[PDB]
């Protein structure tokens, strides 16, 4: 039920002379459509001018409204107030300040329409945000973008954020629900759960994903825990963790909980115990082994760090962090032994395989990446 | 007095026909030399102007179980010759063949053919038995060389280091004393071949330390400091040979802010290991306008946090560094990330809010607020970051921050990485390495 598929159905029904059906279709879809073709077909149908005014209600702010403005004065007046292709061929036909301004503007816009986005859409949004009637202009731009990229979850986040900043969060929630029905990824559901206060999304998405989707399920748990910490506080965060428990929660969920417990409370004991539990569940997880060791060494829990290192298998990075630590605040005697030990381990082919490595974006896409990076945890990322 | 200076000078004397100076050069340099070209020139000069076989014996004593001895043995056995007296000739050529065959070296099969031909000529019967009895020797040396051959063909510091590692494994189960002798030859050959490379003096020092020859090791290092042009061997020397004097000797060569700051960080470490935290701090204070660079503050803040657990003491040091160095992005970013990582939340936030910021400080603070803060504050931080990218108020990023080596070379890299601190790196300013174009 995409823009193009409503369009093609409408055109078939027109061609069929099924006017009962066509009239219900427009009835249901016209107000909501930011597709000019279609409006224009509504015009073709009605023809078989108060109805160019009705269309201009929708497309007056549009950079390709010229033929529409042409066919339709103080009509000439507040087209001249819209940056559009061929505005100079409307001036010539039609106050000079106002036109000049709208022609200067279409210069900055033209290359973004040329090369139409999703990333130039973002660029367009940002340009218009900076510089009641402005709001009206901004609604058109976001909805037209929603039509153009109905499939891309970013567009729905852009408008939602715009709407939130103008105090229209109820309208934002509806845009997100719609985005969730029309695009595909986990992002918009995570943003819906957290920003629009809907805890049900976490359980519902768990049931939907149902091994193959292990990453989704761990990223849901982490994000669900975050929701609960934010909305309810630590004791209910703590209760949700303990309930999650008769399912295989991945290595990441333990590492995430240990880190919340450390940075929220300052306990060293509790994260040690969460990392330790997790290592019992995932005895072969190099991630947990490395992140546990480096966490203990970085917060300064030396004695525990050293005992853990002695018991575990090691990546080169764990070896190199421990060697560098010993050199800085340890002894040369022990430093020399840890070097001997690392060279022995390389030789025995005993070093665990390495973990993968790892103002970027600006404006409203910048904002999106801010949310995305935050929902993502370490190398556990949203994936499709 | 480098090997190459000596080879050049010797060729000069020889081509000039200044035969007096040349013979003097040979007298003072030969026995200390592991450069085969210099010894062959000596052979070539002795052939021209003069028991020649004795000069081959003198040369094969230096290049004992050398892997490119074939030309030496072949020419030597030609000289045995050319001995008046069958029995003594026979004796000598047999000992020559038998010494070669125990040596892993190129062209060993060609000496094997010559050897079998020689024994059979004397007696087809007793000779076949002599050869049969020597076959496993030859075969062992042939096999061993198959593993040496690609290291020599690809000769480099790294393959030199590999040859050291392979011979340290001791596959022939050499008794203590001839294994040591093997290793001394190998390391001295390497020192001569790469006389200018700090690595190889480290390789030899570490070998000698391990066999309880640490005074020998200190003189190896003293030679290397003279032959190389960086600050690796001097730091190694200070710390491993316990020689505090080297810190002031380096302070002269360099008074180069970055090198001065590396040298100060490493001197501070020497004092720490030797005399502990209290004398570490006295040295810090005295450095201590005298004036030192940001890295020295960051280094000392770390050593105090990790060594004593204090949060006040690192805070104060970072703070003092930032007052001496107000425009230091490295310091602002290092100080901020430190406070966030150890969980010093209120100091981290208060610091953040008064500093200029990299995108990484922004990103780390955004992430932290999302994780354990509030959503309205996350949103503001995100607002502020966008505003900051807009005003081009962002501080340009710190430089990005290698591969893993094994055996002896991997040991060199461990000592080097340890001496190095953050983006401060030792270098030899006279060597042109993989990225020389810069």
Q: What one-character-per-residue DSSP string does B341-382 give? A: HHT-HHHHHHHHHHS--BHHHHHHHHHHHHHHS-HHHHHHHH
d(CA B343, CA B349): 11
Angle CA B153–B416–A312, to nearest 5: 95
Strand partners, B424: B421
φ/ψ (deg, to 5) at B71 = -60, -40
| B48, B53, B59, B65: CA torsion to nearest 10 | 140
d(CA B35, CA A109): 73
d(CA B338, CA B349): 12
φ/ψ (deg, to 5) at B395 = -75, 135
d(CA B101, CA B98): 5
DSSP letter at B288?
A: T
Q: What one-character-per-residue DSSP string does A161-213 give? A: HHHHHTT-HHHHHHHHHHHHHHS--SHHHHHHHHHTT-THHHHHHHHHH--TT
d(CA A345, CA B414): 14
**Contact between A187 and A216 (Cβ < 8 Å):** no
Distances (CA, A) of B39 to A257, B23, B97, B220: 70, 12, 21, 23
DSSP letter at A355?
A: P
**Contact between B347 and B339 (Cβ < 8 Å):** yes
Q: How was this structure determined?
A: X-ray
Which residue from B137, B117, B142 is spatially nearest to B127, judged by alpha carbons?
Answer: B117
d(CA A276, CA A266): 17
Rg of chain A over Cα atoms, rounded to whole angstroms, equals 29
Which residue from B40, B90, B97 is spatially nearest to B63, judged by alpha carbons?
Answer: B40
Distances (CA, A) of B80 to B56, B60, B71: 10, 14, 14
**Contact between A379 and A358 (Cβ < 8 Å):** yes
d(CA A279, CA B398): 35
**Contact between A355 and A286 (Cβ < 8 Å):** yes
The two tokens of residue A84 are 């559009």
d(CA B236, CA B199): 11
d(CA B299, CA B307): 12
d(CA B414, CA B405): 9
Residues in CB range of A177: below 8 A, 6 or more apart? A192
**Contact between A39 and A58 (Cβ < 8 Å):** yes
Distance from CA of A159 to the nearest CA of B (A): 16
Distances (CA, A) of B129 to A176, B64, B135, B141: 94, 28, 10, 20
Least CB–CB distance from A370: residue in B366, B374, B410: B366
φ/ψ (deg, to 5) at A118 = -100, -20
CA A215 to chain centre: 17
φ/ψ (deg, to 5) at A20 = -60, -55
Q: Residue A362 and residue B389: Cβ atoms within 8 Å?
A: yes
d(CA B55, CA B43): 7
Which residue from A308, A266, A267 is spatially nearest to A291, judged by alpha carbons?
Answer: A308
Q: Residue B389 and residue A359: Cβ atoms within 8 Å?
A: yes
Distances (CA, A) of B138 to B65, B126, B145, B153: 13, 18, 11, 21
Domains contained in chain A, CATH given: 1-384 (1.25.40.10)
User: Left if phi > 0, otherwise alpha if psi is -120 to 50, otherwise beta: which for B85?
Assistant: left
Q: Residue A363 and residue B374: Cβ atoms within 8 Å?
A: no
The two tokens of residue B86 are 């069958």
The two tokens of residue A198 are 């809907």
CA A111 to chain centre: 25
The two tokens of residue B232 are 């690796």
DSSP letter at A339?
A: H
Distance from CA of A148 to the nearest CA of B (A): 26
The two tokens of residue B247 are 């810190």
Strand partners, B358: B395
d(CA B30, CA B38): 8
**Contact between B42 and B25 (Cβ < 8 Å):** no
- From first CA to last CA, the distance across chain B in angstroms is 30
Residues in CB range of B386: below 8 A, 6 or more apart? A362, A363, A366, A367
The two tokens of residue A153 are 């979850």
Q: Which residues of B touch A (CB under 8 A)?
A: 239-240, 269, 273, 302-303, 305-307, 309, 341-343, 345, 359, 363, 366-368, 370-372, 374-375, 378, 382, 385-386, 389-390, 394, 404, 406-407, 410-411, 414, 417-418
Q: What one-character-per-residue DSSP string does A61-103 give? A: T-TT-HHHHHH---TTTTTTTS--TTTHHHHTT--HHHHHHHH
The two tokens of residue B142 are 């042939």
CA A226 to chain centre: 17
- Residue B415 burial (10 A CB sphere; 0-12, 13-18, 19+): buried
The two tokens of residue B145 are 């060389």
d(CA B236, CA B266): 10
Q: Residue A362 and residue B302: Cβ atoms within 8 Å?
A: no
CA torsion through residues A163, A165, A168, A174, sign:
positive
Burial B202-234 (b: 16+ CB within 10 A, else e): bbbbbbbbeeeeeeebbebbeebbebbebbbbb
The two tokens of residue B69 are 């001895």
Which residue from B264, B267, B278 is spatially nearest to B239, judged by alpha carbons?
Answer: B267
**Contact between B260 and B268 (Cβ < 8 Å):** no
Strand partners, B421: B424
Distances (CA, A) of B107 to A214, A271, B70: 61, 64, 6
d(CA B296, CA A73): 74
The two tokens of residue A58 are 């929708």
DSSP letter at B424?
A: B
> What is the CB-side half-sphere exposure of residue A160 using CA atoms within 13 A?
23
φ/ψ (deg, to 5) at A380 = -75, 105
> What is the CB-side half-sphere exposure of residue B97 using CA atoms within 13 A?
23
Strand partners, B395: B358
d(CA A61, CA B74): 96
Residues in CB range of B394: below 8 A, 6 or more apart? A359, B357, B358, B359, B362, B388
Which residue from B330, B365, B370 is spatially nearest to B350, judged by alpha carbons?
Answer: B365
CA torsion through residues A64, A67, A70, A72, sign:
negative
Q: What is the CB neighbour count within 10 angstroms for residue B424? A: 16
| Residue in chain A lying closest to B374 (CA) | A230
φ/ψ (deg, to 5) at B358 = -75, 160
Which residue from B342, B337, B341, B340 is spatially nearest to B359, judged by alpha carbons?
Answer: B337
Q: What one-character-per-residue DSSP string does B248-282 give? A: HHHHHHT--HHHHHHHHHHHHHHHHHHH-HHHHHH
**Residues composing chain A:** 384
d(CA A183, CA A154): 9
Least CB–CB distance from A370: residue in B342, B374, B382: B382
Query: Which 3 state secondary structure label does DSSP give B395?
Result: strand
Burial B344-355 (b: 16+ CB within 10 A, else e): bbebbbebbeeb
Distance from CA of A365 to the nearest CA of B (A): 10
d(CA B278, CA B307): 12
Query: Which 3 state secondary structure label does DSSP give B421?
Result: strand
Give the CA diameter of chain B. Answer: 104
Residues in CB range of A267: below 8 A, 6 or more apart? A261
CA torsion through residues B228, B229, B232, B233, sign:
positive
d(CA A79, CA A98): 10
d(CA A60, CA A68): 9
Breaks (C-N over 2.5 A) in chain B follow: 50, 255, 401
Strand partners, A377: A380
User: Left if phi > 0, otherwise alpha if psi is -120 to 50, otherwise beta: which for A37?
Assistant: beta
Query: Which 3 state secondary structure label does DSSP give A280?
Result: helix
Chain A hits for B217, Cβ within 8 Å: none
d(CA B430, CA B438): 13
Angle CA A223–A224–A227, to nearest 5: 90
CA torsion through residues A176, A180, A183, A188, sign:
positive
The two tokens of residue B109 are 């099969």
d(CA A75, CA A79): 7
Q: Residue B410 and residue A328: Cβ atoms within 8 Å?
A: no
Chain A hits for B309, Cβ within 8 Å: 300
- Residue A125 burial (10 A CB sphere; 0-12, 13-18, 19+): buried
Report resolution (Å) to 1 decimal: 2.0
Query: Which 3 state secondary structure label does DSSP give B403?
Result: coil
Q: What one-character-per-residue DSSP string does B154-194 give? A: T-SHHHHHHHHHHHHT-TT---HHHHHHHHHHHHHHHHHHT
**Contact between A378 and A285 (Cβ < 8 Å):** no
Chain A hits for B371, Cβ within 8 Å: 226, 259-260, 263, 374
Distances (CA, A) of B151 to B147, B167, B412: 8, 12, 19
The two tokens of residue A119 are 């990333």
**Contact between B330 and B360 (Cβ < 8 Å):** no
- Residue A215 burial (10 A CB sphere; 0-12, 13-18, 19+): middle
Rg of chain B over Cα atoms, rounded to whole angstroms, equals 31
**Contact between B55 and B39 (Cβ < 8 Å):** no
d(CA A313, CA A352): 7
**Contact between B145 and B67 (Cβ < 8 Å):** yes
d(CA A368, CA B13): 76
> What is the CB-side half-sphere exposure of residue A377 using CA atoms within 13 A?
26
> What is the CB-side half-sphere exposure of residue B381 using CA atoms within 13 A?
25
Query: Which 3 state secondary structure label does DSSP give A380?
Result: strand
**Contact between A148 and A116 (Cβ < 8 Å):** yes
Distances (CA, A) of B8 to A342, B26, B42, B223, B419: 42, 13, 13, 20, 36
**Residues composing chain B:** 438
The two tokens of residue B62 are 């230096």
d(CA A266, CA B342): 9
d(CA A106, CA A114): 12
DSSP letter at B2?
A: -
């Amino acid at each position: 039920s995409s823009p193009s598929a409503i369009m093609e159905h409408a055109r078939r029904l027109y061609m069929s002379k099924d006017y009962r059906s066509l009239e219900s279709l427009f009835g249901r879809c016209l107000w909501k459509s930011y597709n000019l073709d279609l409006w224009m077909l509504y015009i073709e149908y009605v023809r078989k001018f108060e109805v160019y005014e009705f269309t201009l209600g929708q497309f007056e702010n549009y950079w390709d409204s010229y033929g529409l403005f042409k066919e339709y004065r103080n009509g000439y007046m507040r087209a001249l107030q819209t940056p559009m292709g061929s505005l100079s061929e409307l001036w010539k036909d039609f106050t000079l300040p106002l036109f000049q301004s709208s022609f200067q503007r279409y210069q900055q816009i033209q290359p973004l329409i040329r090369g139409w986005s999703v990333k130039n859409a973002a660029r367009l949004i940002d340009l218009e945000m900076e510089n009641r009637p402005h709001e009206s202009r901004m609604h058109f731009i976001h909805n037209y973008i929603l039509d153009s990229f109905f499939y891309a979850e970013e567009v729905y986040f852009f408008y939602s954020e715009y709407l939130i900043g103008i105090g229209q969060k109820e309208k934002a929630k509806k845009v997100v629900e719609r985005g969730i029905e029309m695009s595909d990824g986990m992002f918009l559901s995570l943003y819906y759960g957290l920003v629009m206060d809907e805890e049900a999304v976490y359980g519902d998405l768990k049931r939907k994903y149902s091994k193959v989707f292990s990453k989704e399920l761990d990223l849901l748990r982490i994000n669900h825990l975050n929701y609960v910490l934010k909305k309810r506080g630590l004791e209910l965060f703590r209760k949700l963790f303990i309930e999650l428990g008769n399912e295989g929660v991945g290595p990441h969920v333990f590492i995430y909980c240990a880190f919340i417990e450390y940075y929220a409370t300052g306990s060293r004991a509790t994260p040690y115990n969460i990392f330790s539990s997790g290592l019992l569940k995932h005895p072969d997880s190099t991630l947990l082994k490395e992140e546990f060791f480096l966490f203990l060494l970085r917060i300064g829990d030396e004695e525990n760090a050293r005992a853990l290192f002695k018991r575990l298998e090691k990546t080169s990075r764990m070896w190199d962090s421990m060697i560098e630590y010993e050199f800085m605040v340890g002894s040369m005697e022990l430093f020399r032994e840890l070097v001997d030990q690392k060279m022995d381990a390389i030789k025995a082919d005993a070093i665990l395989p390495p973990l993968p490595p790892r103002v970027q974006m600006e404006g409203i896409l910048g904002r999106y990446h801010c949310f995305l990076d935050s929902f993502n945890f370490l190398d556990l990322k949203i994936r499709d």
